[PDB]
Amino acid sequence: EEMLTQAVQEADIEQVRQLLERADANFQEEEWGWSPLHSAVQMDSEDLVALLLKHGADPCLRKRNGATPFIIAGITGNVRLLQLLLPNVEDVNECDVNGFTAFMEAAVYGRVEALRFLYENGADVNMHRKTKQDQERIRKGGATALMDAAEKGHVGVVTILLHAMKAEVDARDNMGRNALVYALLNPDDGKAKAITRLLLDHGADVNVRGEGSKTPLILAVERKNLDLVQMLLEQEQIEVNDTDREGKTALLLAVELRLEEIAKLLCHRGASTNCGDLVAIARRNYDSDLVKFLRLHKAGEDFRPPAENWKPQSSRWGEALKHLHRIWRPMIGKLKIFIDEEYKIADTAEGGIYLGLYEDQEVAVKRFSEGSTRGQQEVSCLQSSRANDNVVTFYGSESDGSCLHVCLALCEYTLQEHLANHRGDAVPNEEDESARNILSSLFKAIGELHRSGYSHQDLQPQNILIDSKNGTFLADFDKSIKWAEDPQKIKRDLEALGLLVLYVVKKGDISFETLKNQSFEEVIQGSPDEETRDLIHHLFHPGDNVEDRLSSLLAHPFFWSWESRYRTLRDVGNESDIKTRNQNSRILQLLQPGTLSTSFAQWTTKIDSFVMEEMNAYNLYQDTLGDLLKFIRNLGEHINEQKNKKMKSIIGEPSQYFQEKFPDLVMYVYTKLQNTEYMKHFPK
Amino acid sequence: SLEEMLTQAVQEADIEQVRQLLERGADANFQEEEWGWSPLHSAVQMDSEDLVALLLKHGADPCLRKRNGATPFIIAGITGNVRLLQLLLPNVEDVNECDVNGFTAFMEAAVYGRVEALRFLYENGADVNMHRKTKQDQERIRKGGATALMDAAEKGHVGVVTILLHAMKAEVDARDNMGRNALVYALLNPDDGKAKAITRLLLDHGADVNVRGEGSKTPLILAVERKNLDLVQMLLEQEQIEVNDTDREGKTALLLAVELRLEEIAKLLCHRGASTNCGDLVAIARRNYDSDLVKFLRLHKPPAENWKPQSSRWGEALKHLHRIWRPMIGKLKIFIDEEYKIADTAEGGIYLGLYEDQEVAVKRFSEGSTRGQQEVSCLQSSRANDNVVTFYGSESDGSCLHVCLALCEYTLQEHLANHRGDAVPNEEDESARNILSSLFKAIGELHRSGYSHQDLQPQNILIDSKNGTFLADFDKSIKWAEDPQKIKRDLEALGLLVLYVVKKGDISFETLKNQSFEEVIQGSPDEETRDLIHHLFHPGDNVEDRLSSLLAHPFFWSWESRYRTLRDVGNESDIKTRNQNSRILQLLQPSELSTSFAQWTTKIDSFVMEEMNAYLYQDTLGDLLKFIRNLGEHINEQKNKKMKSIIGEPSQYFQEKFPDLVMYVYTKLQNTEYMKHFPKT
Ligand SMILES: CCN(CC)CCNC(=O)c1c(C)[nH]c(/C=C2\C(=O)Nc3ccc(Cl)cc32)c1C
Ligand SMILES: CCN(CC)CCNC(=O)c1c(C)[nH]c(/C=C2\C(=O)Nc3ccc(Cl)cc32)c1C
């Protein structure tokens, strides 16, 4: 068991003694390096530190962060533990891996008596923390005990340090920050006031920069504290027109924040009034008195608003996005939004979809009550989908008081809109490349969504968005579920895909409503060609064994171009056994085995007689599939020879010709050669 | 210009010029188009009784709505001057008219803490327990329904709350649509005194103390998180308060108290029946160094390991990181320890993290850093670029900018090493094409986005679990507008990356960077690669398009597609009939340089040569293409079985015998009709 440590937790000294002479006193638990000696000091039991020191336990023994029970004594504050441990210590200024000494830890925990003790015993008071190189290269570390004490707001400790212990007031950390900055970050107003005063009077630089390139003055304004502002403005060397990183001056902030008194005070100390359109800002705040004051001085007449270079990307939403960028709005975290019909994209079962700006990027913002189960499902699924390239990009979510804003990539059109706009783009008898692109993206999207452990549960055309560059994206995961719990619910996504296949192949002419009321067989019968029929079938009957059946369907002839289909038929028809009509051969046994129900039964009679007619000078063309493939191959090769120019005009584009005359041909060949060596002739 | 001068005049509050213009005909119901502000609206807002009088004299409607639906009446409530309200009331149809968010003059009086105005409106029929009725979008997400009481409590207007409760019969346990009462509102006010005062009042009139605010927080929990003993005692004086209520994350008031290092409040909570099996409080106190509370917890008083990482390489450490306790920096859980370190960098290093409970790589910068700003800037614009590493977000802890990125398994370097033994020595390298086409897309799209990377190298290229390749490290990136010809450096580095990847990682990138352009070209194993690299060092003119055009280059064509193209060209009628006139042969008959297929008939095996002259093949390119076509068609016929064995795989044969052939044809037919014979790109 080796449960000594255990006993020290319970602090029962009899079991400890009993088992120092029955386990190791320097035994460190592997996770964090805690020794019983470390643990003893932490809980402040003099009896246990004594007992353990009487069994040789090293008081310079380091735990994971480099902490010795000595340094931990500084935290606990008890001076008689420090006394007990000091005689087995090489340096009193030994620091853990982040540069913390027992003295700093005394300053941090506001342990006044411990601080004095360590002062008398040689503790360095202006020691900056030396940390590991990772932390150094990002300018962390270098903080003093003064800074620690100021931050924590220990008024006691600051004063002692400054006056008794010669603490350096304008000591900087690696970020370039002095104790004054640290002081102003404390949430307690009095403590902060007290500590600022002390620090200021010893000569702390008042034009330092903290986080965000903010001065102490600006920190004070953002704190909304007249008192700290006056204290700071009593110094005459302070720069009042210093700007933070975003270019805001202390005054500007003051007006913005609706701080009449502090604004006035700032103006009466030489704060320039051309750091923003202050009147406008006061006006909008309904700060009538401050308006008047600012008007009296009239310093809102010399300031040009920036002329507006941000260029929206969306064309449909461009104009409104420009307006939204232009106007003033408060932020909800990283999100700028305004709930007005001008910026509304669409209605939803909760909250609607509005244009927004998120980290200055244009976005669609889907809104939910912050309670919402649906909002939680959406955000959950989106958070798992960031790798899925055919899912609408998720920027992030911002909660306000009572509303979950989900920010998504802005797309131009819905699938429905898009199909309508592009309905005239192909003449009736021309290949629909677009349908393939759309549907392959959806297959990938849903495939990947399933791999992610999610099922959509409401696939329909309103949930499918098209971007400026014709890319298609799946959206709306408010009804999604983790399928793991109920794996056969995936089937419903696949069914909806099946309806989407038809919807898209029909270029939006049949409504999705219509298609949802149809039975599986009605949908299949509605399919214009055999490839589509076969494809949809496989989606409505996916099989319990349906891991990644979506990905296998991307190889289906539906996704083959008409050139590739023709190319495949040609390549099969160039197999030597088809050319030599070797009926015994493997290929012909795959294609024509045994012994009329196909559109290419007696195919020679259905092709124009001249072509056939002139297609016969070499024993002849018979009505086998074999011979049709041969025919396709031969025409393929010779159609463009100059002597065949009449043939060419009768036929037109050969791929189109054969598929139209023989709609089942491509599918028939695919089926016969599917899992064979001749699969090699299929498209890429 | 006239109404504009009126409006303008009212701003300056020059009453003479207003008068002048009302009689000179100017309209006082003129609304500016942006926000709907009338001179009457504007007058009230700035509190000039003289101007509201003058304008009301001239028929100016006091029920005139601006963009949010607010009437100058409602705005008077904000101004809180009673004599404006007096002046406007005799034309008002309803005193409880609200703007589009449901705000009445009375609410606005409560909101701005305007005591005198509140009284006036009370006497004149203002409804005191009016909930805001807002538009249906806002309603469907349960916003709105707030009262003047709630407004006053939130704002912490102690005056107004008191009057409302006592004088004006305000309902204390009135709820908004979220289900919040004024108590919740009250506890959100940052000023301790005001909050204390208002809570007391509200509690004594019988405000429900078991209500839910944001985050499913009770009032009790809000008080704990505020760190305010006083507000906690007030709340715990009620005995019907549920002390073991949990917020959304399942944290109890006590738990929070221990977690936050609030000894006194923790003790008080235990002494009121707060159950001690809500978390491992001792451990928590222990870690806080809260010795006394430890002791107290010991004298008074978890397993759920189900999180599975996706990364296999990083899985075990990610499990540890998930398991341990760390404080959050916003949405980021991170621990700076060697165990969780992925790699070293120019500043901060790369560590494993959890971001919204998703595993991520975290790149660290000084929050000041120009470099960290460049990275975050470029990433924020790159979210559409599928071949750029996914950007989750950035969290600042106040001294350090944490940039969180998708965690990938391997670097390009590592990946090439792991897969170096997979292919036989001379196999076609499909993998190099995939990797490089992804990079071409990534950098192409990055340029289209206005950014250039400036430090493209194999350590900046990452491979995910599913063999996808991603560009990362935008710390030295720039908006290229600033110097457009610095794009060329990305293109050059791409050129070195082409070689690096074609050489399967065997040549170091260092090595390649020290070579001159001509040495790089000479080091290239084939003509496709040579030509491609050349075009990267000597680019065209289209920034975010050249790269996309180069995806059509024969380097990216499979060996089958190359062979297919040469066959299809060689089946053009004019090549077969040897029509020297013809357009195709004119395009193929260029001064020139010595090509490896000059007198090609002499260096193709003599048996094949003879068998193929099946009765005159000349040393033209035309005739070579014809040869390729014919062999293509007949190679598998049974009578050619000896030919087949000599040749082996025909694509490989021709490219190896004639390394410049594919390139030569590409170049001759590039921008012609016969481009149609190229593979679909
Ligand atoms: C075109 C008129 N028609 C009414 C019969 C449809 C009204 N518009 C929409 O339905 C609509 C449109 C045009 N776009 C959208 C949704 C968008 C949208 O347009 N962009 C977008 C980005 C992300 C998310 Cl989640 C949702 C969207 C919606 C819901
Ligand atoms: C095998 C030792 N060798 C260096 C001595 C390589 C060790 N690892 C890496 O170099 C490395 C690895 C495994 N991953 C990364 C970088 C990653 C990384 O793995 N994910 C990731 C996300 C975003 C960004 Cl900006 C950078 C990265 C790096 C730099």
Side-chain angles (χ1 to χ4, degrees), chain A residues 1-21 23-89 91-129 131-484 486-543 545-684, chain B residues 1-23 25-92 94-132 134-543 545-681:
Chain A
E1 275 36 53
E2 194 274 330
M3 273 182 315
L4 170 73
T5 42
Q6 133 99 35
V8 174
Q9 306 295 37
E10 296 191 1
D12 84 72
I13 293 248
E14 114 250 53
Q15 194 169 191
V16 175
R17 201 171 235 98
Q18 195 160 119
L19 301 174
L20 282 159
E21 54 201 316
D24 182 354
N26 286 35
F27 159 73
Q28 309 202 260
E29 59 87 50
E30 248 67 44
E31 190 95 338
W32 297 107
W34 285 89
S35 71
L37 179 56
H38 281 115
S39 182
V41 174
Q42 174 190 48
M43 67 173 25
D44 207 333
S45 156
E46 310 230 308
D47 292 60
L48 288 159
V49 173
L51 176 47
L52 290 164
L53 277 171
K54 277 163 174 276
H55 280 81
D58 195 317
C60 283
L61 186 63
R62 293 174 173 264
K63 64 208 232 292
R64 202 186 240 286
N65 78 264
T68 56
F70 184 63
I71 287 155
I72 299 207
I75 297 171
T76 39
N78 172 333
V79 242
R80 214 211 267 85
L81 301 175
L82 289 151
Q83 278 172 357
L84 236 167
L85 300 156
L86 189 144
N88 297 121
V89 161
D91 199 347
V92 71
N93 304 317
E94 57 151 294
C95 52
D96 74 27
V97 304
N98 295 299
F100 275 97
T101 59
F103 180 72
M104 278 151 200
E105 294 291 17
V108 161
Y109 284 81
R111 307 267 128 131
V112 175
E113 17 82 76
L115 194 75
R116 291 184 195 286
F117 180 98
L118 295 159
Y119 181 48
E120 293 150 19
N121 295 236
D124 193 343
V125 171
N126 311 315
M127 189 160 263
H128 304 251
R129 301 212 260 290
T131 183
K132 54 204 152 177
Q133 211 180 1
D134 263 328
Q135 301 290 55
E136 283 174 323
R137 266 205 312 286
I138 58 162
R139 302 171 67 201
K140 257 199 207 291
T144 71
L146 215 212
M147 290 169 181
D148 288 326
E151 183 190 337
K152 299 292 143 159
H154 287 311
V155 189
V157 176
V158 168
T159 310
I160 290 157
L161 279 163
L162 281 176
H163 290 126
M165 313 200 168
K166 314 147 187 288
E168 282 161 22
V169 69
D170 210 34
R172 306 308 191 72
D173 66 15
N174 301 316
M175 194 99 292
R177 287 179 300 184
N178 68 16
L180 181 47
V181 173
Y182 280 78
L184 292 170
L185 287 169
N186 189 24
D188 176 298
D189 300 275
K191 284 166 182 207
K193 268 182 278 217
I195 290 159
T196 307
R197 147 187 313 118
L198 291 137
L199 271 15
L200 282 176
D201 291 29
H202 268 339
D205 193 333
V206 86
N207 304 307
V208 281
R209 302 293 191 159
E211 180 254 50
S213 205
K214 299 172 182 303
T215 59
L217 177 53
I218 292 158
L219 277 170
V221 180
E222 283 212 311
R223 236 196 195 283
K224 311 170 172 265
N225 194 273
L226 187 48
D227 322 78
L228 288 163
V229 180
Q230 227 140 23
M231 222 177 277
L232 288 164
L233 289 171
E234 275 157 28
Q235 326 293 308
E236 351 98 290
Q237 72 290 1
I238 196 154
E239 296 246 67
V240 298
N241 302 322
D242 264 348
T243 49
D244 67 350
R245 203 190 313 295
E246 322 229 48
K248 298 213 161 113
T249 236
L251 204 210
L252 177 54
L253 275 155
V255 187
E256 273 176 5
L257 285 182
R258 208 185 181 286
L259 304 171
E260 188 189 23
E261 218 36 78
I262 297 155
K264 287 177 173 163
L265 176 43
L266 279 156
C267 309
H268 288 146
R269 278 286 288 92
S272 175
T273 329
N274 301 300
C275 57
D277 182 358
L278 302 182
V279 164
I281 292 163
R283 192 177 72 172
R284 86 145 163 265
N285 283 332
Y286 292 84
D287 205 323
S288 297
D289 267 14
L290 181 53
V291 164
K292 284 169 193 187
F293 173 103
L294 287 160
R295 272 207 207 284
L296 277 174
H297 297 210
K298 293 201 169 165
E301 212 263 82
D302 332 63
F303 199 85
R304 165 169 64 99
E308 287 267 289
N309 292 112
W310 167 84
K311 153 154 86 322
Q313 261 143 53
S314 162
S315 161
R316 171 165 194 189
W317 305 118
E319 288 306 319
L321 251 17
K322 274 154 41 230
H323 200 177
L324 178 56
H325 191 87
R326 189 134 28 71
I327 71 180
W328 182 81
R329 294 294 310 159
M331 298 297 279
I332 304 167
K334 300 163 214 215
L335 176 61
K336 188 193 194 190
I337 189 167
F338 180 33
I339 305 311
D340 191 86
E341 276 299 318
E342 192 196 344
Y343 306 105
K344 184 166 179 69
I345 294 168
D347 295 275
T348 71
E350 276 194 51
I353 312 279
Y354 287 83
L355 294 166
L357 295 163
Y358 183 92
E359 305 168 322
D360 215 53
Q361 298 290 123
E362 72 203 50
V363 287
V365 185
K366 187 167 183 196
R367 291 160 83 238
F368 303 93
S369 20
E370 71 95 36
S372 197
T373 309
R374 288 161 91 263
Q376 293 306 316
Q377 243 317 299
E378 180 106 41
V379 59
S380 212
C381 183
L382 287 165
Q383 284 166 355
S384 313
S385 276
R386 306 182 98 132
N388 188 332
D389 295 336
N390 292 110
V391 167
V392 69
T393 317
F394 175 49
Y395 279 68
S397 57
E398 290 287 353
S399 172
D400 74 5
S402 49
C403 174
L404 209 206
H405 300 79
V406 181
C407 312
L408 307 162
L410 189 62
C411 295
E412 294 289 81
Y413 303 105
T414 272
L415 172 59
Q416 193 175 346
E417 296 171 305
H418 177 82
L419 292 169
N421 310 337
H422 286 68
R423 184 64 188 74
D425 291 10
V427 294
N429 264 210
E430 171 169 323
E431 181 171 4
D432 198 352
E433 234 203 274
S434 184
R436 292 200 292 262
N437 301 340
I438 294 166
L439 289 171
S440 85
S441 307
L442 288 166
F443 279 40
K444 288 172 192 114
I446 290 150
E448 186 138 344
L449 188 75
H450 296 157
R451 256 115 59 203
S452 313
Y454 282 92
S455 181
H456 190 280
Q457 299 298 287
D458 188 57
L459 280 161
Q460 40 149 309
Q462 279 199 142
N463 296 339
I464 295 173
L465 307 184
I466 311 296
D467 73 3
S468 312
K469 315 131 82 212
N470 293 322
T472 108
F473 298 87
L474 184 61
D476 300 321
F477 308 88
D478 63 310
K479 305 206 180 86
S480 77
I481 61 179
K482 293 171 99 73
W483 57 273
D486 188 336
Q488 94 105 30
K489 226 107 78 88
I490 275 174
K491 274 236 291 281
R492 300 165 40 78
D493 279 352
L494 267 36
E495 279 155 9
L497 247 189
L499 303 182
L500 283 164
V501 172
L502 193 48
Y503 178 71
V504 178
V505 166
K506 298 306 303 172
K507 314 180 107 157
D509 298 338
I510 308 175
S511 92
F512 202 70
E513 300 299 314
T514 296
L515 292 170
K516 231 134 85 259
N517 296 331
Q518 287 178 6
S519 73
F520 296 168
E521 299 230 317
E522 293 191 304
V523 171
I524 293 170
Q525 207 61 13
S527 303
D529 59 299
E530 284 296 311
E531 293 80 9
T532 303
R533 181 162 286 193
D534 195 274
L535 173 59
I536 285 170
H537 189 277
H538 289 290
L539 290 165
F540 295 146
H541 302 110
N545 38 229
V546 70
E547 281 78 340
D548 262 285
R549 101 95 64 247
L550 253 31
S551 64
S552 44
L553 287 167
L554 297 159
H556 185 276
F558 178 81
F559 296 97
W560 305 357
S561 76
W562 292 6
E563 161 56 29
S564 288
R565 289 164 185 201
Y566 178 50
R567 184 68 272 179
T568 284
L569 299 179
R570 292 165 70 182
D571 293 350
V572 172
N574 193 61
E575 278 282 349
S576 36
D577 316 270
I578 285 189
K579 285 178 316 192
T580 72
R581 217 184 270 109
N582 181 0
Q583 263 301 339
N584 307 140
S585 71
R586 180 133 170 77
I587 190 77
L588 282 187
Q589 276 316 118
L590 267 25
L591 295 162
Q592 280 155 0
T595 212
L596 148 88
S597 181
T598 72
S599 94
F600 55 85
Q602 60 271 336
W603 61 261
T604 50
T605 67
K606 222 166 285 184
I607 91 101
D608 188 83
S609 318
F610 170 96
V611 175
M612 208 56 249
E613 174 169 283
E614 205 204 324
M615 197 30 82
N616 316 43
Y618 14 110
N619 40 299
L620 266 212
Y621 285 120
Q622 297 159 216
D623 297 334
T624 69
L625 175 55
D627 272 8
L628 214 198
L629 277 7
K630 174 147 114 284
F631 183 86
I632 286 171
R633 192 231 82 127
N634 289 334
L635 192 145
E637 291 311 284
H638 306 308
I639 194 62
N640 281 300
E641 292 186 348
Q642 145 128 36
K643 78 183 256 286
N644 282 327
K645 223 109 96 71
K646 220 272 210 219
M647 205 157 72
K648 197 185 206 307
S649 36
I650 295 173
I651 284 175
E653 197 288 303
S655 188
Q656 181 151 47
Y657 181 76
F658 293 113
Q659 291 186 70
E660 292 358 309
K661 242 85 181 172
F662 310 121
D664 43 352
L665 181 61
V666 164
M667 271 294 131
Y668 193 94
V669 182
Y670 178 66
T671 306
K672 296 297 178 191
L673 310 185
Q674 233 186 315
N675 293 297
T676 73
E677 60 258 59
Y678 301 109
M679 195 164 50
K680 67 176 180 273
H681 296 314
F682 290 178
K684 266 297 148 173
Chain B
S1 203
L2 190 133
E3 274 79 0
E4 299 188 332
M5 272 206 108
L6 166 55
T7 307
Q8 176 65 176
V10 176
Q11 293 302 311
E12 297 164 28
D14 188 308
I15 297 121
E16 242 189 56
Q17 193 197 167
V18 173
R19 204 184 297 97
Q20 291 168 5
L21 299 168
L22 282 158
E23 288 150 37
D27 183 2
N29 293 29
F30 166 70
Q31 310 206 255
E32 59 87 50
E33 251 139 36
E34 189 91 335
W35 297 108
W37 283 87
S38 73
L40 181 53
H41 280 116
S42 283
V44 172
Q45 176 183 49
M46 67 178 320
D47 193 11
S48 156
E49 198 229 315
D50 292 293
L51 288 161
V52 179
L54 174 50
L55 289 164
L56 277 171
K57 166 181 190 215
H58 280 82
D61 193 320
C63 288
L64 189 60
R65 291 181 175 267
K66 65 170 168 62
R67 200 183 227 191
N68 72 343
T71 59
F73 186 62
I74 289 154
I75 301 308
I78 299 171
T79 340
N81 172 326
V82 215
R83 213 206 258 82
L84 307 174
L85 288 142
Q86 277 171 359
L87 282 160
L88 300 154
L89 187 144
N91 295 121
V92 165
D94 186 5
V95 71
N96 306 315
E97 64 179 3
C98 55
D99 74 27
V100 304
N101 297 298
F103 274 97
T104 58
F106 182 71
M107 279 151 201
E108 295 290 18
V111 162
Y112 285 81
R114 307 267 129 130
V115 173
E116 331 73 56
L118 197 75
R119 292 192 174 287
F120 182 98
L121 293 158
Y122 181 47
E123 293 146 338
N124 291 285
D127 194 342
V128 171
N129 314 312
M130 189 162 231
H131 305 312
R132 302 210 260 290
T134 183
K135 56 206 159 194
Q136 211 179 359
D137 264 322
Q138 300 298 270
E139 268 184 8
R140 267 205 312 285
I141 58 163
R142 299 159 49 82
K143 254 181 136 81
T147 70
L149 216 214
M150 292 167 205
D151 288 326
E154 181 167 25
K155 281 286 190 287
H157 287 312
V158 190
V160 176
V161 170
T162 309
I163 291 158
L164 279 163
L165 281 174
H166 296 165
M168 315 199 166
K169 306 151 178 65
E171 283 187 9
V172 70
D173 210 34
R175 306 308 191 71
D176 69 27
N177 300 314
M178 193 96 293
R180 283 197 287 258
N181 69 13
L183 183 48
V184 175
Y185 283 95
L187 291 162
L188 289 167
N189 196 97
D191 176 61
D192 278 304
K194 287 166 183 155
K196 269 146 62 31
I198 292 161
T199 307
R200 168 49 37 60
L201 289 152
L202 270 18
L203 285 176
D204 292 358
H205 284 68
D208 193 333
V209 87
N210 303 308
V211 281
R212 300 295 192 162
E214 108 70 52
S216 208
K217 295 174 174 308
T218 59
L220 180 51
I221 291 158
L222 279 165
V224 183
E225 283 210 310
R226 193 200 271 262
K227 311 153 195 266
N228 195 272
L229 186 47
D230 322 81
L231 291 163
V232 182
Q233 284 171 160
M234 303 194 195
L235 289 166
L236 289 173
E237 275 156 28
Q238 328 294 307
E239 313 115 284
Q240 71 291 0
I241 194 156
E242 295 292 301
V243 299
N244 303 322
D245 264 346
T246 50
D247 65 353
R248 193 169 310 295
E249 322 145 35
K251 300 217 174 178
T252 237
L254 206 206
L255 178 56
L256 275 155
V258 188
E259 273 180 7
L260 285 142
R261 209 186 181 289
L262 304 170
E263 190 177 331
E264 322 91 293
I265 296 155
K267 285 177 187 161
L268 174 44
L269 279 157
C270 309
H271 289 135
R272 277 286 287 93
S275 86
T276 334
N277 225 251
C278 51
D280 184 351
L281 302 180
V282 206
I284 294 165
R286 192 174 74 200
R287 134 189 111 224
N288 283 332
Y289 290 95
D290 209 319
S291 328
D292 325 330
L293 179 53
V294 165
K295 287 185 182 84
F296 182 82
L297 281 172
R298 247 196 264 283
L299 198 58
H300 200 143
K301 261 310 90 271
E305 296 150 273
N306 57 263
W307 185 90
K308 190 152 130 59
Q310 290 193 115
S311 162
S312 164
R313 171 163 193 190
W314 307 118
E316 71 309 305
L318 253 15
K319 274 158 162 157
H320 199 204
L321 178 57
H322 190 74
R323 191 137 27 70
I324 71 175
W325 181 84
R326 293 293 308 162
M328 300 298 279
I329 307 166
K331 296 159 147 136
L332 177 60
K333 190 200 192 178
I334 188 170
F335 181 32
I336 305 310
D337 192 48
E338 276 298 316
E339 191 191 337
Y340 305 106
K341 185 178 171 170
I342 292 166
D344 310 56
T345 71
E347 43 161 300
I350 311 278
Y351 288 83
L352 293 166
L354 292 162
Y355 183 92
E356 304 170 328
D357 216 53
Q358 307 301 122
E359 73 207 48
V360 287
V362 186
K363 187 167 180 193
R364 291 161 80 236
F365 304 86
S366 128
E367 71 94 36
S369 196
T370 302
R371 286 164 28 105
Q373 279 148 48
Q374 264 147 57
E375 179 107 40
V376 60
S377 148
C378 185
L379 287 166
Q380 285 165 356
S381 311
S382 274
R383 308 187 100 130
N385 188 332
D386 294 336
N387 293 109
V388 168
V389 68
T390 317
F391 175 49
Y392 280 68
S394 59
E395 293 286 354
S396 172
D397 80 0
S399 47
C400 173
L401 209 207
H402 299 79
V403 181
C404 312
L405 307 156
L407 189 62
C408 294
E409 293 291 81
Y410 303 106
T411 272
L412 174 55
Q413 194 170 322
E414 297 171 306
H415 177 81
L416 291 166
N418 306 341
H419 289 67
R420 185 65 189 77
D422 295 8
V424 295
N426 267 15
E427 178 177 357
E428 184 173 2
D429 199 352
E430 296 142 273
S431 182
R433 293 201 292 261
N434 300 341
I435 291 168
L436 287 170
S437 85
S438 307
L439 287 168
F440 276 50
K441 289 171 180 137
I443 294 153
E445 235 262 274
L446 190 75
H447 295 158
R448 289 207 289 96
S449 170
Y451 284 85
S452 181
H453 189 280
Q454 299 296 290
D455 188 54
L456 277 167
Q457 39 166 238
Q459 277 111 353
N460 295 338
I461 294 172
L462 307 186
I463 310 296
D464 70 5
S465 19
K466 310 90 51 60
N467 270 40
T469 109
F470 301 90
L471 188 59
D473 311 345
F474 305 86
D475 51 337
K476 300 163 216 244
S477 63
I478 61 180
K479 288 155 266 292
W480 55 268
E482 93 188 50
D483 187 353
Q485 108 143 42
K486 227 94 70 61
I487 270 166
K488 294 256 308 287
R489 281 165 33 82
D490 278 355
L491 268 33
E492 282 180 26
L494 238 196
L496 299 181
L497 282 166
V498 161
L499 191 48
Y500 176 72
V501 176
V502 164
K503 301 305 302 188
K504 318 195 85 138
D506 297 340
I507 312 310
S508 91
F509 202 70
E510 250 283 280
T511 295
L512 289 170
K513 290 183 81 189
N514 296 332
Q515 288 175 10
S516 77
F517 171 61
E518 350 295 299
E519 294 190 310
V520 170
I521 294 297
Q522 206 60 13
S524 302
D526 58 65
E527 284 294 313
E528 292 80 10
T529 302
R530 280 186 178 190
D531 193 275
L532 179 56
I533 285 167
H534 188 277
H535 283 123
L536 288 166
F537 281 75
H538 309 82
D541 288 344
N542 224 122
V543 168
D545 268 54
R546 41 213 178 204
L547 251 25
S548 62
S549 321
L550 285 166
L551 294 160
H553 182 277
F555 177 80
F556 295 98
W557 306 356
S558 75
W559 291 4
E560 174 50 21
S561 291
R562 289 162 184 199
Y563 179 50
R564 186 68 272 181
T565 287
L566 295 180
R567 290 166 69 182
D568 293 350
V569 172
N571 194 59
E572 276 281 346
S573 348
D574 302 8
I575 283 179
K576 288 180 307 200
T577 71
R578 216 187 268 106
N579 182 44
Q580 191 70 342
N581 259 119
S582 70
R583 177 129 182 72
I584 189 78
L585 280 187
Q586 229 69 244
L587 268 25
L588 297 155
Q589 213 275 276
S591 92
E592 254 316 314
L593 225 267
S594 71
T595 74
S596 175
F597 49 83
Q599 66 267 336
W600 61 261
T601 51
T602 68
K603 69 338 300 336
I604 180 274
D605 186 357
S606 56
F607 172 55
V608 179
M609 208 50 258
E610 287 193 73
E611 289 255 315
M612 210 73 69
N613 269 324
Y615 266 121
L616 273 130
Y617 286 120
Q618 294 180 281
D619 297 335
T620 68
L621 178 53
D623 272 7
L624 215 194
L625 276 8
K626 176 141 64 69
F627 183 95
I628 286 168
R629 192 232 82 123
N630 290 334
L631 192 146
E633 291 310 280
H634 308 308
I635 196 61
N636 283 303
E637 294 173 11
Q638 110 92 11
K639 56 80 77 89
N640 280 328
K641 211 172 281 200
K642 222 97 175 201
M643 207 169 68
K644 195 180 204 282
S645 35
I646 294 174
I647 285 176
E649 197 289 302
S651 185
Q652 185 153 29
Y653 181 75
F654 291 110
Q655 292 186 71
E656 212 272 320
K657 200 114 280 186
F658 310 121
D660 46 345
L661 181 48
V662 165
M663 277 296 140
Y664 192 96
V665 178
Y666 180 66
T667 307
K668 295 297 168 196
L669 312 184
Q670 207 170 338
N671 296 297
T672 72
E673 78 215 75
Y674 302 107
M675 194 184 59
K676 68 178 171 193
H677 298 315
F678 295 175
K680 254 36 136 302
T681 265

